[PDB]
Design an enzyme around this catalytic site. Structure first.
Site, mmCIF file in Angstrom:
data_model
loop_
_atom_site.group_PDB
_atom_site.id
_atom_site.type_symbol
_atom_site.label_atom_id
_atom_site.label_comp_id
_atom_site.label_asym_id
_atom_site.label_seq_id
_atom_site.Cartn_x
_atom_site.Cartn_y
_atom_site.Cartn_z
ATOM 1 N N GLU A 195 -3.694 28.986 25.471
ATOM 2 C CA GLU A 195 -4.899 28.048 26.071
ATOM 3 C C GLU A 195 -4.897 28.225 27.626
ATOM 4 O OE1 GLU A 195 -3.187 24.888 23.516
ATOM 5 O OE2 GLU A 195 -5.143 24.520 22.958
ATOM 6 N N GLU A 206 -3.306 19.625 23.725
ATOM 7 C CA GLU A 206 -3.323 18.332 23.597
ATOM 8 C C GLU A 206 -2.187 17.410 23.205
ATOM 9 O OE1 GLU A 206 -6.715 18.521 21.003
ATOM 10 O OE2 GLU A 206 -7.844 19.610 22.509
ATOM 11 N N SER A 216 -12.155 28.878 25.221
ATOM 12 C CA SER A 216 -13.504 28.474 24.598
ATOM 13 C C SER A 216 -14.117 29.845 24.046
ATOM 14 C CB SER A 216 -14.526 28.028 25.389
ATOM 15 O OG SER A 216 -15.548 27.285 25.064
ATOM 16 N N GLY A 230 -10.458 22.264 30.792
ATOM 17 C CA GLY A 230 -10.502 21.251 31.682
ATOM 18 C C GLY A 230 -11.739 20.773 31.942
ATOM 19 N N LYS A 282 -9.596 19.675 14.994
ATOM 20 C CA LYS A 282 -9.011 18.724 15.559
ATOM 21 C C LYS A 282 -9.458 17.289 15.083
ATOM 22 C CE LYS A 282 -9.408 21.226 20.115
ATOM 23 N NZ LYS A 282 -9.883 21.183 21.490
ATOM 24 N N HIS A 329 0.225 22.427 20.703
ATOM 25 C CA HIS A 329 -0.973 22.367 21.284
ATOM 26 C C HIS A 329 -1.152 21.827 22.442
ATOM 27 C CE1 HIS A 329 -5.423 21.672 21.609
ATOM 28 N NE2 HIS A 329 -5.453 22.735 20.778
ATOM 29 N N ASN A 354 -9.591 25.174 14.524
ATOM 30 C CA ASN A 354 -8.769 23.959 14.913
ATOM 31 C C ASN A 354 -10.111 22.907 14.837
ATOM 32 O OD1 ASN A 354 -7.296 21.567 15.479
ATOM 33 N ND2 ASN A 354 -6.907 22.352 17.584
#
Lengths: 241, 244
Positions: free
Chosen positions: B163, B95, B206, B169, B11, B93, B9
């Site tokens: 996720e 976000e 990650s 974060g 992004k 997702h 991704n």
């Protein structure tokens, strides 16, 4: 002394075959030279439209984010838009605001970033049906234009579009709002800017009412929707001939 | 045995120049053929990425709306995505959910429309740091999976990505395995043993060349949904996570 400006917002419509035939109609038509024409297509076709569009029609995106790069899945930046031939971006459209919850501050930041990135902006404003029934047309529209003006340094690059979203309006009602908006600009920004800024009518525009709406002293063009996908868009562009 | 699946991704990153390099890297790389690879690029470059990507990498969009056509300025549909060479779409997702307030019912309708349109879907779930430290990692992940499962009728077309938003974060391979495990059990008991048996569940935390190998060996981790590293050469090494 304001140049008539006509934008076409295809919204979520379009395929390679349908877009191509719309472009052929555009470059194959007799368009009034005096008019500044713009079309906003879906992001997946930006580079494609730019190849089929005649130099008399500028390319716009329908939205963008407030930064150049980032962890923002699904968002596109002014940089990507320019990279694909675009010169304009529609920001603050009623559908982004009401269906997608985009607030004034966010829109304000998008406009600021879009402008510093070398993109022109069609900033939209408009009140809902309930706002109007409660004599709130001005309170809503002024607050929205306030957040826009606050992020505009060079007005020669923005065009304002008024959306009577409350109408889901007469040439008289649209002229009144455009008139008040200009007055707001004249007293809160400058006389100079209020005189030169184009204010497009973002209401329902068709071949049948474009000439009358366009004659209104404070209406400097249109932000067309469904008709921008049809041959009728050519007649709307030629509203002032 | 589920087929390992690695998604990239990008992004909000990419230019015609930068994207050309990444494709050339993938095109000129030595990729484990057992792996199903996917890359999600910004909508403006779909048609462009397709022509430069090798047939071993599938193309994905980062989002889409729930209808084919309409008065939805700024939205794109599965139809346009496919018209431009896309075969996948990332939905739900973190976000979109948190930054752009996309909710469960809306994500559910997008998933159903993308599927009937002939698109494959990478459906994302994940709890916030607030939810985790509150002992409701499961209740959040189950609600989300519930709304997803309810809009899926052909599981062969869907891949689920977890996720640990609560960390993006640090989250270990152990805690990631535990979540994938519970999600699979949710599916096994609420959908079917067969579906839970075959559905791929990617780790969307990650991922780097440093941990991909041990994250991948986890019995319930069937791949990754890589972020920043999918723009770098290490994405190749991540794809090759299960290589010998």
């Amino acid at each position: 002394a304001r140049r008539f400006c006509v934008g076409g917002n295809w919204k979520m419509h379009g395929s390679k075959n349908s877009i191509r035939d719309i472009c052929n109609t555009l470059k194959g038509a007799s368009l009034d030279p005096n008019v500044e024409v713009i079309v906003a297509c879906p992001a997946p076709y930006l580079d494609y439209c730019r190849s089929l569009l005649p130099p008399s029609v500028a390319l716009a995106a329908q939205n963008c984010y407030k930064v150049e790069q980032g962890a923002f899945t699904g968002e596109i930046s002014p940089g990507m838009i320019k990279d694909c031939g675009g010169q304009w971006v529609i920001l603050g459209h009623s559908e982004r605001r009401h269906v997608f919850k985009e607030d004034d501050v966010l829109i304000g930041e998008k406009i600021k970033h879009a402008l510093e990135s070398g993109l022109n902006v069609i900033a939209c404003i408009g009140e809902l049906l309930e706002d109007r029934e409660a004599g709130r047309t001005e309170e809503v529209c002024f607050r929205q234009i306030k957040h826009i003006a606050s992020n505009v340094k060079d007005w020669s690059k923005v065009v304002i579009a008024y959306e009577p979203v409350w109408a889901i309006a007469t040439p008289d009602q649209a002229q009144e709002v455009h008139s008040k908006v200009r007055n707001w600009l004249s007293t809160n920004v400058s006389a100079d800017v209020a005189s030169k800024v184009r204010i497009q009518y973002g209401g329902s525009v068709n071949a049948g009412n474009c000439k009358e709406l366009g004659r209104k002293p404070d209406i400097d063009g249109f932000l067309v929707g469904g008709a921008s996908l049809k041959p009728e868009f050519v007649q709307i562009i030629n509203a002032m001939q």
